[PDB]
Amino acid sequence: MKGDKKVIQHLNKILGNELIAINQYFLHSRMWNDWGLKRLGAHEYHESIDEMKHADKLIERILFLEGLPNLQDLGKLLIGENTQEMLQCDLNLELKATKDLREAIVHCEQVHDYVSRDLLKDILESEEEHIDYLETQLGLIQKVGLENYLQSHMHE
Amino acid sequence: MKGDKKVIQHLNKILGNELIAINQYFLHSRMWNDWGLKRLGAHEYHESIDEMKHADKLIERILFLEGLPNLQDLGKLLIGENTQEMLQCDLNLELKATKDLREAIVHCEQVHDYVSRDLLKDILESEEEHIDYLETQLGLIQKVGLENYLQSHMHE
Amino acid sequence: MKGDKKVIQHLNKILGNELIAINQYFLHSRMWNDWGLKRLGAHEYHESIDEMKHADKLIERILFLEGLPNLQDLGKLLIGENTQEMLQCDLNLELKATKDLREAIVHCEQVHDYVSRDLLKDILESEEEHIDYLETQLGLIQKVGLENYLQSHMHE
Amino acid sequence: MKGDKKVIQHLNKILGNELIAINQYFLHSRMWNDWGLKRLGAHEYHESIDEMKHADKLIERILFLEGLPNLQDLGKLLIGENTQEMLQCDLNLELKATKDLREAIVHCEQVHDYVSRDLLKDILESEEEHIDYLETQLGLIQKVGLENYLQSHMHE
Amino acid sequence: MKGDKKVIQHLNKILGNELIAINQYFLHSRMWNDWGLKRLGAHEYHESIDEMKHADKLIERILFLEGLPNLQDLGKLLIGENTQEMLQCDLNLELKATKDLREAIVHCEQVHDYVSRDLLKDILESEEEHIDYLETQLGLIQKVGLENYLQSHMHE
Amino acid sequence: MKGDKKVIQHLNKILGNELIAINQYFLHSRMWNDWGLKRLGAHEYHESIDEMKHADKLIERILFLEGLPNLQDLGKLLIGENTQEMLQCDLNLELKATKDLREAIVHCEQVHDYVSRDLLKDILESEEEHIDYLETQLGLIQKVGLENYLQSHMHE
Amino acid sequence: MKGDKKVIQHLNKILGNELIAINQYFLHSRMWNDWGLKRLGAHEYHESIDEMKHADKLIERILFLEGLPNLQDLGKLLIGENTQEMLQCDLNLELKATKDLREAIVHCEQVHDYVSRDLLKDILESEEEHIDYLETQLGLIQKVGLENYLQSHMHE
Ligand code: HEM
Ligand code: HEM
Ligand code: HEM
Ligand code: HEM
Ligand SMILES: O=C1NC(=O)c2c(NCc3cc(Cl)ccc3O)cccc21
Ligand SMILES: O=C1NC(=O)c2c(NCc3cc(Cl)ccc3O)cccc21
Ligand SMILES: O=C1NC(=O)c2c(NCc3cc(Cl)ccc3O)cccc21
Ligand SMILES: O=C1NC(=O)c2c(NCc3cc(Cl)ccc3O)cccc21
Ligand SMILES: O=C1NC(=O)c2c(NCc3cc(Cl)ccc3O)cccc21
Ligand SMILES: O=C1NC(=O)c2c(NCc3cc(Cl)ccc3O)cccc21
Ligand SMILES: [K+]
Ligand SMILES: [K+]
C-alpha cells in the first residue's frame, strides 16, 4: 500500500533509534554480566530484546507501506564506563527516542496514517516504561547508596 | 433496626478515620512503588485494602442501625516526604484511630450495643497489628540504618 | 519524567471525579444491599471497584510525571433516596466525568502526551459502558414497571 | 451441473428473502440488547445466524446448478418500534418466506430437482419452527402481560 | 447517550461499506469453493466473517449513540469473473473502505468521540491487514505464474 | 411386504447402475494408485465404497419388497486410459445414473412408495455430490493445467 | 583475563561480519514475508537469529579477554532485489565470513588461545551449514525453475 513518503522517513528515523538502542543495551547487558551484576545484565538483555521486537514491527510496517527499511545507518552508541553512567546513557537515548516518537505521531496524525500512529504509540508506551525504570534506578542509587544498589543487582 | 444515635455518630467518626487511612496509605503505597521500594509499596497497599474492608463493615453496620454513613467528609491526610516520615505519619494516624475506637467501645458497652462493640474490637485488633508493624519498621531503620532498610524493601 | 503541568492538573481533575464516584457507588451499593436488592448492590459494587482501579492508574501516572496526586479534596456526592434517583445521580456524575475526560484528552493531544491520552481513552471506554448500563436500567424501569424492575434485582 | 433456470430463479427469490431476514433479525437483536432485553436479543441473534446458514446453502446450491446467486438485491426490511411490533414484523416476513418456499418446492418437484426440493423442505421446517416461536411469544404477551413478558426477557 | 449526528452518518457509511464487503467476500468465497480453490474459499470466508463482526460492532455503537443503523441500503458489489479480477475487486472495495474510515476518524476526533474513533481505528487495522493480503496475492500471481498460484490454493 | 412390480424393476435398474459404478470406480482407483496418483486413487476408492453401500441398501429394499435383486447383469464399464478421460467417464456414468434415479422417483411417487422414494432421494444427493466433485476436477484441470493438476494428486 | 590484542582484533572483525549478517538476513526475511514467500522468510529469520547468538558469544568472549567489543561500526549490507539475488548476496557475505574465520583461527592457534579457536570453529561449522543451504537453494532454482521454487516457498 503506497505510504506517505514522510511517514516512511519518520519510521526509518525511529528504526534508526532502535538499532542504536539494541546494540547499546546489548553491550551494556554483557558488560554487567561480565562484572557479576547479573540482575542488571538480565534486565538490560530484556530491554534489548524489546527494542528488537519494536524494530521488527517498524521494518514490517515500512515494507507494507512500500518503503525501504534503513538497516545500514547506525548512529552513535552511548556506552557508559560504570553502572551509573550506563544507566544515564540509556536514559539520554530514551529521551531522544521519545522526542522523535512524538514528532512521528504528529505527522502520522496529520496525513491520517492512523495505524502507523497506533504502532508508534505502543512503542512510546514501552519507552516510557523504560524511562520509568531508569529514572527509578538512578534514584535508588541515591537512596540506598551505590554499593547496596550494586549488591542488590548481583544475583537473579 | 433503629440504633442508638450516639453509637452511630461514633461509627461515622471511626469511618471518617478509615477514609483518611485508605487514601493516605494508598498514596504512600504508590509513592514507594514509584521510588522502586516495591516491598514497602506492596505492604502499604495491603494496609489500604484492610482499611477499605473495615470501612465496608462500618458502612454496613451504620445502614443496618438505620443511620446515614458519612462518605462526604474527609479529614486531613498526613503525607510524608520520605520513608521515615511516611511511616511516622501512618503511626500518628493509627494512634488517633485507636484512641477513637476505645471511646466508641466504651459507649457501645454502656448502651448494650454488644455487636457494634465486637466489630470495633475486631477493627482495633487489626489497627494494633498495624501499629506493631509501623513501630517495628521505625526500629529497624535505627538498627540496620536507613540505606540497608530501604535496600531490603526494594524487591518483593 | 517531568510532565506538562496542565496535563497533571487535568489528571488530578479526573482523579477527583473518580474519588467522588468510588464513594457514591459504594454507598449506593451498600444501600441497595441493605434494602435486599442484591443484584443492584453487586453490580454497583463492581462499578465502585472499577473506579478504584481507574484512580490507581491515574495516581500512578501522575507520580510518574512528577506531580502530586490529590487525594485530599472530595467533591459533592450525589446520593439518591430511591432506586430511580440513585441511578440518575450515577448517570449525572458519569456525564460530568466523561465531559472532563474529553477535555483532558484534548489537552494531552495538544502537548503530545500520547500515553496519558491512551490511559484516558481507556477510562473513557469504561465510563461509556457504565452510561450505557445506567441509561438501560432507567429505560427498563419504564418498560417493565418499577415493581418488576426491583423484583428482577432482588437476587444475584 | 446445468440446473433448471426457473429453479435457480426460485432459489434466488428464497435467497433474497433470507438476506432480508438476516438483517431484520440482526437489527432487532441488537435493538433488544441495547434496551436490556438480552434474552430476546440472544434468541433473535440465533435466528439471524440460522438464516445466514440457510443463505449459505442456497448460494452453494445455485452455484452448483451453474446459476448466479443474487446478493445484490435487498428487499424492504420490516423494523418494529416496540417489542410487540418487532415480533409481528418477524412473523409477517416469515409467512411471506414460507409461502415462497412452498411455491419453489412445487416447481422443483415438477422438474424433478428432488435435491433442491429436499434443501427447501429443510429450510421450511426451520422457518415453521421460527413461526411457532413467534406466535408463541405474541400469545405469551397476552397471557402474562407486556410488562411481565419483557421482565422475563431481561436476563439470559 | 446522544451521539453527534454526523458521527452517526459516518458510522452508517462505514457500515454500508461492511454490508457490501460481507456479501462480496461471501460470494467470492463460495465461487472459489465451487471451483475447487478451497484455500482461497476458506480464507475469503474468514474475511467475510471478519466484516460481519465489524458490522456488529458498528451497529451496536450506532444504537448506543441513539442513531438508527442502516441495514437497508446496499451499494454495488464488485464481483470478478476470474481469480485475478476477484482479488482486484476486493482490493478496490478495501481502498474505498479505508478512505472512508480515515474521513470518519477525522470527524470523530474533531467532535471528541474518542471511543468511536478507537473502534474505527481497530477496524482500519483489520482492513489494512486485508489489503496487505490482497496485494501480496496479486504479487504472487506475477511471481509464481497464474497456474501455480491457483494450484497452491486448491487444498487447505 | 409386496411391492409394486415396476418399482422393483426401477430399483433393479438403479442397482445395475451401482454395480457398474462399483467396478469402474474401483478399477480407476487402482489404476491411479498404480500410476502414483494416490490422492485420486484414495478418493476414487471411497467413491467405489459409497456405491457399494448404496447397492447394499437397494438389495435390502428389493428383498423387503419381495423382489429378486439382480446381481447378474453387468452393463458396460466406461474405463478411461488417462486421468481426464477417467473423470469424464465417471461423469458420464453419473449423469446417466441420476437420470434413472429421477425416473424411478417419479414412479415411486405415483404408486405412493414414499420410503423407496426417500431411499432414492438420498442416493441422488450422494450422486450429485459426486457430480460436483467430478465437474470441479475437470474444471481444475483447465485452470491449473494438467501437469500441476496431476502433481497435486500424487500424495495423500 | 588479558587476551592477545591481535586475537581481540580478529574477534572484533568476526563480530563486524556478524552484525552485517544479522541485519542483511533480517531484512531479507521480512522482504520475503512481505512478498508472501513465508517459508523463505521463516528460514531467513532463523538464520538472522543464529547470527545474533554468534554475536552474543563473540561479545562475551571479547569482554572476558578484557577487550572492547565493536558494535558501532557496521559494514555494507548486500541487499538483493529479487529472490535469486538475495540468496547470492547471502552466499557472498558467508564466503567472506568464512575466510575471515579461517584467518582468525590461524592466529588463535599461533598464540595458543585454544578456547577462542574452539568458539570460532563452532561458528565456522554453522556458517558452512548456511553455505550448504544457500548453494542448495540456488541449485534448486535451476532444477525446478524459479516459478516452482518460489511456489514451494509460499507456505510454511
Ligand atoms: C536489526 C537488528 C536486530 C533485530 C531486528 C533483531 C530481532 C530479534 C528478534 C525479533 C528476536 C526474537 C525475540 C523474541 O521473540 O523473543 C531476537 C532475539 C535475539 N536477539 Fe536480536 N535482533 C537484532 C540485533 C541483535 C544483535 C546485534 C544482537 C546481539 C548483539 C541480538 C541478539 C539476540 C539474541 C541473543 C536473541 C535471542 C535468541 C534466542 O532465542 O536464543 N540481536 N532478535
Ligand atoms: C469509600 C472508600 C473505599 C471503600 C469502601 C473501598 C472498598 C474496597 C473493597 C471492599 C475492596 C475489595 C477488597 C477485597 O476484598 O479484595 C477494594 C479493593 C480495591 N480498592 Fe478500594 N475502597 C475505597 C477506596 C479506594 C480508593 C480511594 C482507591 C484508590 C485510590 C481504592 C483502590 C482499590 C483497589 C486497587 C482495589 C483492588 C481491586 C482489585 O481487586 O483489583 N479503593 N476497595
Ligand atoms: C449474505 C449475508 C450473510 C451470510 C451468507 C452470512 C453467513 C454467515 C455464516 C455461514 C456464519 C457462521 C455461522 C456458524 O456456523 O457459526 C456467520 C456468522 C456470523 N454473522 Fe453472518 N452472514 C451474513 C450476513 C451477516 C450480517 C449482515 C451480519 C451483521 C450485521 C452478520 C453477523 C454475523 C456474526 C456476528 C456471526 C458470528 C461470527 C462469530 O462466530 O464470531 N452476518 N455468517
Ligand atoms: C455387489 C457388489 C459389492 C457390494 C454390494 C459391496 C459391498 C461392500 C460393503 C457393504 C462394504 C463395506 C463398506 C464399509 O467398509 O463400510 C465393502 C467394502 C469393500 N469392498 Fe465391496 N462390495 C461390492 C463389490 C466390490 C468389488 C467388486 C470390489 C473389488 C473389485 C470391492 C472391494 C471392497 C473393499 C476393498 C472393501 C473394504 C473392505 C475392508 O477393508 O474392510 N467390493 N463392499
Ligand atoms: O538498509 C538497507 N535497506 C534497504 O532496503 C537496502 C538496500 N536495498 C536494495 C533495493 C531492494 C529493492 Cl527490492 C528495491 C530497490 C533497492 O534499492 C540496499 C542496501 C542497504 C539497504
Ligand atoms: O456521605 C453521605 N452519606 C449519606 O447518607 C448522604 C446523603 N444522603 C441522602 C439520603 C438518602 C436517604 Cl435514602 C435518606 C436520607 C438521606 O439524607 C447525601 C449526600 C452525601 C451523603
Ligand atoms: O492528597 C494529597 N496528595 C499529595 O501529594 C499530598 C501531600 N503531599 C506532601 C508532599 C510530599 C512530597 Cl514527597 C513532596 C511534596 C509534598 O507536598 C500532602 C497532603 C495531602 C496530599
Ligand atoms: O449478486 C451478484 N451475484 C453475481 O453473480 C454478481 C455478479 N456477477 C459477475 C459474473 C461472474 C462470472 Cl464468473 C460470470 C458472469 C458474471 O456476470 C456481478 C454483480 C453482482 C452479482
Ligand atoms: O435499516 C434500517 N435501520 C433502521 O433503523 C430501520 C427502520 N427503522 C424503524 C424505526 C424504529 C424505531 Cl424503534 C424508531 C424509529 C424508526 O424509524 C426501518 C426500516 C429500515 C431500517
Ligand atoms: O561499540 C562499542 N563498544 C565499546 O566498548 C564502545 C565504547 N566504549 C567506552 C568505554 C567503556 C569502558 Cl568500560 C572503558 C573504556 C571505554 O572507552 C564507546 C563507544 C562505542 C563502543
Ligand atoms: K412479575
Ligand atoms: K507446480
Residue numbers in the entry:
A (entry chain E), B (entry chain K), C (entry chain F), D (entry chain I), E (entry chain C), F (entry chain G), ...: 1 to 156
Pull text from the paper:
In , the iron storage protein bacterioferritin (Bfr) contributes to buffering cytosolic free iron concentrations by oxidizing Fe2+ and storing the resultant Fe3+ in its internal cavity, and by forming a complex with a cognate ferredoxin (Bfd) to reduce the stored Fe3+ and mobilize Fe2+ to the cytosol. The Pa Bfd binding site on each Pa BfrB subunit dimer is a shallow depression on the surface demarcated by residues L68, P69, N70, and Q72 from one subunit and L78, L79, G80, and E81 from the accompanying subunit, where Pa Bfd residues M1, Y2, and L5 bind. Small molecule derivatives of 4-aminoisoindoline-1,3-dione designed to bind Bfr (Pa Bfr) at the Bfd binding site accumulate in the cell, block the Pa Bfr–Bfd complex, inhibit iron mobilization from Pa Bfr, elicit an iron starvation response, are bacteriostatic to planktonic cells, and are bactericidal to biofilm-entrenched cells.
These experiments allowed us to obtain X-ray crystal structures of KM-5–25 and KM-5–35 binding to Pa Bfr. As has been observed in previous structures of similar analogues bound to Pa Bfr, , the 4-aminoisoindoline-1,3-dione (phthalimide) moiety binds at the Bfd binding site on Bfr with a conserved pose, establishing hydrogen bonds with the carbonyl O atom of P69 and the amide NH of L71. The linker and phenyl ring of both compounds interact with the cleft formed by the side chains of L68 and E81 in Bfr. The structure of KM-5–25 bound to Pa Bfr shows strong electron density consistent with KM-5–25 in several of the subunits, and although the phenyl ring exhibited conformational disorder in a few of the subunits, the subunits showing prominent electron density indicate that the Cl substituent of the phenyl ring is directed toward the floor of the cleft, while the hydroxyl group points toward the protein surface. The results obtained with KM-5–25 show that when the compound is present at the MIC, the rate of killing is slower than that observed with KM-5–35, and although the number of viable cells is reduced by approximately 3log10 relative to the inoculum in approximately 3 h, cell growth is observed at later hours. As can be observed in Figure , treatment of the pellicles with KM-5–25 or KM-5–35 elicits concentration-dependent biofilm cell death.
